[PDB]
Every structure is written in C-alpha cells, then in structure tokens.
Amino acid sequence: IPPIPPVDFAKYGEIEEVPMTRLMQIGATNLHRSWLNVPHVTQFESADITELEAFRVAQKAVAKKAGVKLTVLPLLLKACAYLLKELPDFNSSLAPSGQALIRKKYVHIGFAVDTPDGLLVPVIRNVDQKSLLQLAAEAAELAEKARSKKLGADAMQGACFTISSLGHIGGTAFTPIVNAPEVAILGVSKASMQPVWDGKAFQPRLMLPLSLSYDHRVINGAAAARFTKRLGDLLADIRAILL
Amino acid sequence: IPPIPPVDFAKYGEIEEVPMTRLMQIGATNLHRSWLNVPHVTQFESADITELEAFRVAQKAVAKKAGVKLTVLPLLLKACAYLLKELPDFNSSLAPSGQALIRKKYVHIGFAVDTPDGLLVPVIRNVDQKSLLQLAAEAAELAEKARSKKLGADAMQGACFTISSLGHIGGTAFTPIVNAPEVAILGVSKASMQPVWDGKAFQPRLMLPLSLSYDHRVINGAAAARFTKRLGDLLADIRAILL
Amino acid sequence: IPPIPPVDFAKYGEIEEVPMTRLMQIGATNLHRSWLNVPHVTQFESADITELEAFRVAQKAVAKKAGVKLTVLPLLLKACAYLLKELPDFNSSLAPSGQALIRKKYVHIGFAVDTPDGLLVPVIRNVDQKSLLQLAAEAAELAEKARSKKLGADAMQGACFTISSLGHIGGTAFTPIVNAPEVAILGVSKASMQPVWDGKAFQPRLMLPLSLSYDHRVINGAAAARFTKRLGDLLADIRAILL
Ligand SMILES: CC(C)(COP(=O)(O)OP(=O)(O)OC[C@H]1O[C@@H](n2cnc3c(N)ncnc32)[C@H](O)[C@@H]1OP(=O)(O)O)[C@@H](O)C(=O)NCCC(=O)NCCSO
Ligand SMILES: CC(C)(COP(=O)(O)OP(=O)(O)OC[C@H]1O[C@@H](n2cnc3c(N)ncnc32)[C@H](O)[C@@H]1OP(=O)(O)O)[C@@H](O)C(=O)NCCC(=O)NCCSO
Ligand SMILES: CC(C)(COP(=O)(O)OP(=O)(O)OC[C@H]1O[C@@H](n2cnc3c(N)ncnc32)[C@H](O)[C@@H]1OP(=O)(O)O)[C@@H](O)C(=O)NCCC(=O)NCCSO
C-alpha cells in the first residue's frame, strides 16, 4: 500500500513528540490488519428499551444487595448470546482456506474497555449460561482488572463477538471495526427519548442506537438487517428469551 | 496486506466446519477487491414518500390485473434511471488508465437479490425506457430466476448502478459496498412515520431512509449530496419525472 | 491489491470517454492512499444550534457592514480550534516510526471547497487566534481564490484538521475520509428542526448533524465520542469559549 509522505510539521509551528504505549501500537497494528482484510458494512437500527430500562432501574435494590451495578451491558450480553445461538453464522469465523466457516458451538463475548494506556477487550466465557447479575459482576471485575493493567492474556482470548459501548459518553451512532477473526461487532450509543408513531400519534419511547458492523464475505446484508431486527425485538421484550 | 493469524478455535469449545458455496466465495473475492480499490464514502438522506406510498397502494388493483406486485423498487428504479441521466458522472466508470471516465449512454440497473446460496445481482436493461409495471414484472421474474439458480450470466452483466434494498426487513441505514467497476450503489432501508416540521408544527410524514455509497475518486461529496437531494425530491413528487 | 478486471463497456451500449482533470487524479491518488493507510471509524452526533443560529442571523447587520457573510463555518472553525487545544490528540499526527505522535502546538484548519476542476482544501492558519468576522472574511477569500484556480500551494499546506461542509446542499450524515497525515475530519450536514424531549414534552430545536471520521490507530472510540460531545456542547452555548 503506498505510504503517506513525511511532512516537516515543525515548519508550521511548534511541535512536540510524545510516544505511543505498546498497547496503542499493538492496537494500531491489529486494526490495520482488520481494516485491510474485512470488507466492512455497518447496519444501523434503534431498539425501544422503554420497558427494559424501567426493569433495570426497578432491580437496583437487588443489584445493590448483590454488590453489582446493573447497567445496559449485561442485558446486551444476554440478548446477543441468545441471538448468536439463533443465527450461528454470526458466531463463526472464516477458515484460513477462505472456503469454509468454522462454526463455534460456544458463546464467549468480548467487550471494549477504555484504559489510559489503550483499548483492551476482556472476554466473558459462556455468556449464554450466566445470569444478569453474574454477567454484571464479571463485567465489572474484568473492567477493573483491565484498568489496573492486572488483566492477563488468558482473559482476552477466544471471543466470538464484541460489544463496544459508548452509551455512557454520547453519540448517535458510529461504525466500529470488526475484530478479526471475529465476524461482527455491535456498537451501542446513547439512549434518547424519541417520538415513535403508534398508528395515531407520536409517543415518547426510549430508543437505544445500535450499530452492527460485519464482515460482508461471511455475512450478507439481509442476514445482518435480520440480526439487528431480532435484537431490537429481544430488547423491547426480554421475556422472549424465556421462550 | 498482512494476514490474520490462524487461531486454534477448538481450544475454547466445540467447533464445526461448514463450507462456503462457490457463490459466497466468488462474492467474497469481489467485495474484497472493491473494498481495497474504492475509497468509499456514504451519504445518508431521507425522502418523504407519503404521497408515493398512497399512489402505490391505490394502484394495487391495476397491478393485480397485470399480475405484478408494485413495491417501492420499480419506483426507485424509474427515479434513479432519470437521475442517472441528469447526473452522468454517476452513470460512468473509471477507465483502466486511471485518467478518464467512461460515460455510459445507456441505463441498465442491477438490484441485489438474496438467495440461499449467496447474493446475486440481476440487471434490468434500459430501465429508463420501461414503465412501472414493466419494471415491476421484470424485477419479479429476475428475482425468481435468481432464487431458482436458473439465472444465467447474460443477465448479470453490464450494469451501471445497483440498488440494494433491505426495507422489507428493517434497519435505519447501512453503508453498502460499491460494486466495482460501477461507481455508486443506493441502499434502501425501512420506511417509518416521522415528525417533520412544517414551519409551525410537526406533521407525520412517511420517511424512506436512503444510503448512497460512492467511489470518492470519481464522485466528490457535494455531487453525491446533490444526487441524494434530487432523488429525495423526485420521490416526494414522481410527477416531476414527466417534465 | 488485486485490480478490477477491465470490461468492454461498449458491449452494452454507447460509451463516451471524458478525461479527468489533473486535480481529480491528484485527488484520487491521495484518497486511495488515505483509505488504505487509515483504519476509519465515523462517530455521528447532533448539536442544538437553536441559539447559535439566532445569534448568526441577528449579527447579519454587523457582518454586512464588515463586507463578510457569517455562515455556520466560522462558528465551527472557532469551536473546533478551541477543542483542538482542549483535546491535543486530535491535533497531532502519527510519526513515520509508527511509535509516536507528533503533537502540533499550532491550530491551522483546512476546509473543503468544491470547484469545477475538483476538490481543494485551503488552510486558515492560527484559527484559534482570529475572530468570527476574520475567519468569515478569510474563508470567503480562500474559497474565491480556490474557485478561480488562483489559490497557490503555500495555502494548502500544514493543516491540522479539516472541516467538510455539505450543509448548504442537503443530507443527513456522511462518512468523510481522513486526509492523512491529519487524524480526524468533521463532516457537517444540513440543519433540521427536530423534536427534542425536555423531560415533559418535545420541543422543536434546530439540530446540526456532525459526522467525525477518525484514524482509529491514534484515536480510540471514547475519545472521539467525547470530542463530538464537547463540540455539541460548545455549539449549544458558544459563550463557554469565553471561560
Ligand atoms: C466498561 C464499559 C464497557 C461499560 O460501562 P457500563 O457498565 O455500560 O456503564 P458505566 O461506564 O458504569 O456508566 C454507567 C451509566 O451510564 C449509563 N449508560 C450506559 N449505557 C448507556 C446507553 N447505551 N445509553 C444511555 N446511557 C447509558 C448506565 O446505564 C449508567 O447509568 P447510572 O450512572 O445512572 O447508573 C465502558 O465503561 C467502556 O469503557 N467503554 C469503552 C468502549 C470503547 O472505548 N470503544 C472504542 C473502540 S470503537 O470501535
Ligand atoms: C427482491 C428484493 C430486491 C426487493 O423486494 P421488494 O419488491 O421491495 O419487496 P418484497 O420482498 O416483495 O417485500 C414487499 C413488502 O415489503 C415492503 N417494503 C419494501 N421496501 C420497503 C421499504 N423500503 N420500506 C418499507 N417497507 C418496504 C413492500 O412495499 C411490500 O409490502 P406488502 O407486503 O404490503 O406488499 C428483496 O426481496 C431482496 O432480496 N433484497 C436483498 C438485498 C440485499 O440482500 N442486500 C445485501 C448486500 S448489502 O451491501
Ligand atoms: C465554501 C463552503 C466550504 C462553505 O460554505 P458556507 O460559508 O457554509 O455557505 P454558502 O456556501 O455560502 O451557503 C450558505 C447558505 O447555506 C446555509 N448553510 C450552510 N451550512 C448549513 C448547515 N450546515 N445547515 C443548514 N444550512 C446551512 C448558510 O448558513 C447560508 O444561509 P443563507 O444563504 O441564508 O445565508 C462550501 O460552499 C463548499 O464548497 N463545500 C464543499 C465541501 C465538500 O465538497 N466536501 C466533499 C468531500 S466529502 O469527504
């Protein structure tokens, strides 16, 4: 690939060189490798989490008794685990021959944590088997280890899918980069109150923005529009996961 | 381009290898080729199809008498053909010297069909010369041949522009990949009722999400913001095509 | 990278070859170089410019007396200069060793101008030191020189960040390409009246669509969600820049 020509940046004013941490560098190399290997598409959707939110907030007592804080992330993790089992193509990777998919029968899910030194993506194993407060507690433990640089490589391996959550900061949508050899990544942005038409008038519903980026060699657009659609349905009524 | 390192995925759980159809593989190779050759931008827009819809639905009788089903796709196809003639840069391809555009004086348009074996994009020739019920009928014939694997290569060649429609499934917007050597692709997502300000109060209008991805070497951003804008205008009043 | 196979386009109809200007070609080569080097993410946001607009429109008299026309671009330029100093990572470039950032202590900002021959991006130097009517006047001078092909290379060098504005044409959002070796680019689309919930009811606020694309090797997603968030806040009350 052509390189970018070097520029004497100090011609224009005062410059200062600050160096990258090895995590940045590792991170930089991996994203570039994914960017060049994966033909990326992003499918955007909005889920009505009006009732999910009222549940989350009413279980605050139980959550405080268990020592966990229940945010939207354990709820996303449960729903995606369920879906990764209903739509296995999303749970798989392109074999190195380029002529097969390796379907994973397990569901481990990574989530992006933002630390001073760079990005880490700890993995929760067998997300499909834990409950909302287990996932709540583990998510929190892995994030504090990540931030403390006390997270060990054992816990950043073997993920099938990644959730990248910026809802705590802001934003309307974004287009995340697939962590190859995974095939998809859900980005989550900030929930807003919005008018949603009911057939007769607009009702304020609390809408969660979802951005699913995917590897188009493996996933075609209708399958991904279908994934986001089912996720939007599961989050509108999480009791459907009981069925 | 660096490859992605192989991972023993079976360390983490049970795996199963399922193979890709030759269509997937063909598809995979082509998208990767487009991804690396085309600097992609996506321009998003929403068109008010409140009146277009009421027309579509009122002509249901005529459509049933002709045996066709009239969806939004023949209407998109007519409007894009008209526009591909008003803005010829969108109707062209970058010559292999890299120093010229080959302007096509014809309008043939492909549309993405989703089949069990992978994606096919049949082509309707001379879209600019057929009527809404001709395009309606041909679209339907080509899609059933595509699904029946009875579509023959003659009909997947010489397209100038592609429409990729997921409105039947869901979604807010997405970023399609340009089918090189074409220069643009319109993605269409699901229409929603939305509040649109009239100067004094918000009115429910039925809004169609459009995502136009384009080859930025050939098309600059203002030309594409202008294409989506004119398309939004043509769909708001399709009688302007008579002018 | 594999090339795209040549197609005899004249099999399908009449073709015409028209050639690219040297600006297109230069432009084409640079975008391709950026596309392959930068792993791109776009973060979308909306800023409430209801009060900013009423200010802009009330200062029309002062502006007419100074000979300038004050649009939203000098206001974007001031706010981004302020922010490029609060968040210096956005004001920097990846050193050629790939292991350091070169932090620029200056703020010069480029803006995309659309001319018949192709795209030019003149640079305003030391944006952080000029006022709204200085930036208003210079922006206008550089754009008319650009359009007159009388802009000279001196003025297209040493930029730290680019603003690409299509608000004058239309569109909901788009994903611009980073001008390497810069690390981010703000795209601006058309402002719309929109319902924004106040805790009790929806209020029409005039919303500006922002699309920030960035070089993910250098900028991680939470930093960019934070940049767009602060910009949305500065534009909601530009007096915060006085603080
Ligand atoms: C650890 C975590 C992954 C997840 O955090 P979390 O458990 O959702 O929440 P948190 O950080 O504790 O913040 C929680 C508050 O914000 C709220 N919030 C979280 N998601 C929200 C959403 N999507 N919408 C609105 N509000 C949200 C929580 O519900 C919570 O409310 P209270 O303060 O009232 O309890 C996140 O802190 C993080 O670091 N994200 C970084 C992701 C990233 O950097 N991606 C970059 C790569 S881009 O390809
Ligand atoms: C054949 C077709 C292209 C087009 O189908 P179509 O003719 O528009 O409609 P359909 O499939 O018959 O479904 C029609 C129903 O959904 C509705 N629908 C279609 N577009 C709609 C839209 N954009 N918004 C809302 N509803 C829509 C129709 O109007 C119709 O309504 P009724 O059932 O009441 O008549 C589509 O079936 C298909 O396979 N699309 C796949 C595209 C794709 O996979 N892209 C992937 C690559 S991503 O880069
Ligand atoms: C010179 C300029 C950069 C900026 O123009 P400007 O100073 O904002 O405004 P303008 O062109 O004079 O048009 C101004 C009118 O549109 C309005 N307008 C500008 N931005 C607006 C916005 N974001 N929302 C709504 N309206 C807007 C102005 O406020 C102004 O209103 P009046 O006519 O009532 O005064 C632009 O003309 C241009 O050429 N943009 C091209 C960008 C581009 O091509 N990008 C492509 C690469 S894509 O990666």
**Residue A28 forms contact with C (CB below 8 Å):** yes
Q: DSSP alpha helices (H): ranges in chain C?
A: 22-37, 50-58, 60-65, 73-86, 132-147, 221-236
Q: Is residue B162 exposed (0-12), middle (13-18) or buried (19+ Cβ within 10 Å)? A: buried
Q: Is the peptide bond before A204 cis (omega within 30 degrees of 0)?
A: no
A49 lines ligand 1 (CB under 6 A): no
Residue of the nearest CA to atom 21 in ligand 3?
C167
Chain A contacts in chain C segment 36-75 (CB below 8 A): 36-37, 39-46
CA C23 to CA C180: how far, in whole Å?
17
Tell me if C87 sits within 8 A of C93, measured CB to CB: no
Residue A137, number of CB atoms within 10 A of its CB: 19
Is B216 catalytic? The answer is yes
Place of tokens 């951005």: A211
Ligand 2 pocket test, pick from B60, B68, B71 with the greatest ligand atom count within 8 Å of Cβ, gives: B71
Residues with CB under 6 A from ligand 3: B 41, 220-222; C 71-73, 111-114, 119, 143, 164-168, 176-177, 188, 190-191, 208
**Distance, CA of A117 to CA of A70 (rounded, Å):** 26
Question: End-to-end distance of chain A based on CA atoms, in angstroms?
Answer: 51
Query: What contacts 24+ positions apart, CB below 8 Å, involve A82-89?
Result: A82/A128, A82/A234, A82/A241, A83/A227, A83/A230, A83/A231, A83/A234, A84/A109, A84/A128, A84/A160, A84/A161, A85/A128, A86/A230, A87/A223, A87/A226, A87/A227, A87/A230, A89/A183, A89/A218, A89/A219, A89/A223
CA atoms within 13 A on the CB side of B59: 17
Q: Does residue B104 contact residue B81 with C-beta atoms inside 8 Å?
A: no
CA distance B235 to B52: 7
Q: Taking a C-beta distance cutoff of 8 angstroms, is the pair C73, C163 a contact?
A: yes
CA separation, residue B194 to residues A50, B207, C61 (Å): 19, 6, 37
Q: Report the alpha-carbon angle C229-C233-C236, nearest 5.
A: 140
CB distance C221–A25 less than 8 Å?
A: no
Burial (0-12, 13-18, 19+ Cβ within 10 Å), C3: exposed
Instruction: Kindly provide the resolution of this structure in angstroms, with one decimal.
Output: 2.6
| Ligand with the closest atom to the CA of C221 | 1
Q: What is the CA radius of gyration of chain B?
A: 20
Token pair for C22? 């040297």
Alpha-carbon span C180 to C94, nearest angstrom: 9
Q: Is A82 in the pocket of ligand 1 (CB under 6 A)?
A: no
Distance B166 CA to ligand 2 centre (A): 6
Q: Are strands C118-120 and C113-115 parallel, antiparallel or unpaired?
A: antiparallel
Domain assignments of chain C as residue spans, ordered by start:
1-243
* C164/B contact by beta carbon, under 8 A: yes
What does the longest C-alpha to C-alpha distance in chain B come to?
A: 66
Peptide bond into A96 cis (omega under 30): no
Structure tokens at C128: 């952080």
DSSP B18: E
Query: Per 3-state DSSP, what percentage of chain C is helix, strand, and coil (rounded to 5)?
Result: 40, 25, 35
Query: Distance between CA atoms of C71 and A44, rounded to whole angstroms?
Result: 31
Residue A121, ligand 1, Cβ within 6 A: no
C-alpha distance from residue B116 to each of A11, B23, B146, B149, B168 (Å): 58, 10, 10, 10, 17
Residue with tokens 């002709």: B66
Residue nearest to atom 16 of ligand 2 (CA): B168
Q: How was this structure determined?
A: X-ray
Cβ distance A3 to C34 under 8 Å?
Answer: no
The CATH number of the structural domain formed by B1-243 is 3.30.559.10
Q: Can you give the length of chain C in residues?
A: 243
- Residue B47 burial (CB < 10 Å; 0-12/13-18/19+)? buried
Q: How far is C139 from chain B (nearest CA, A)?
A: 18
Phi/psi-derived region of residue A134, left when phi > 0, alpha when psi is between -120 and 50, beta in every other case: alpha
- Nearest residue to B115 via CA among B54, B26, B13: B26
| Nearest CB to B170 within list A39, A45, A158 | A45
Ligand with an atom nearest the CA of residue A177? 1
Question: What is the number of H-type helices and E-type strands within chain C?
Answer: 6, 13
Q: Does residue A124 contact residue A73 with C-beta atoms inside 8 Å?
A: no
CA distance A115 to A137: 19
DSSP-assigned letters across all residues of C96-119: TTSSEEEEESS--EEE-EEETTEE
Q: Report the residue of chain B nearest C166, measured CA to CA.
A: B222
In sequence order, which ranges of A87-220 are alpha helices (DSSP H)? 132-147
| Rounded distance between C-alpha atoms, residue C16 and residue C22, angstroms | 19
The residues, ordered by sequence, that sit 6+ positions from A39 with a Cβ below 8 Å of its Cβ are: A215, A216, A217, B31, B32, B34, B35, B177
Max Cα-Cα span within chain C? 66
Q: Running DSSP on this structure, what letter comes out for residue B199?
A: S
Rounded to whole angstroms, how far apart are CA atoms C134 and B165? 47
d(CA C55, CA C78) in angstroms, rounded, equals 15
E-only strand ranges, chain B: 15-19, 40-48, 92-94, 100-104, 109-111, 113-115, 118-120, 123-124, 162-165, 173-174, 184-188, 192-197, 202-215
Count Cβ atoms within 10 A of the Cβ of residue C173 and give its class: 0-12 exposed, 13-18 middle, 19 or more buried.
buried
**Rounded distance, CA A74 to CA C200, Å?**
29
Residues 100-129 on B with a CB inside 8 Å of A are 112, 114, 118-119
CB C94 within 8 A of CB C152: no
A94/chain C closest Cα distance in angstroms: 20
Bond preceding residue B181 cis, omega within 30 of 0: yes
CA dihedral of residues B26, B31, B32, B34 (deg, nearest 10): 130
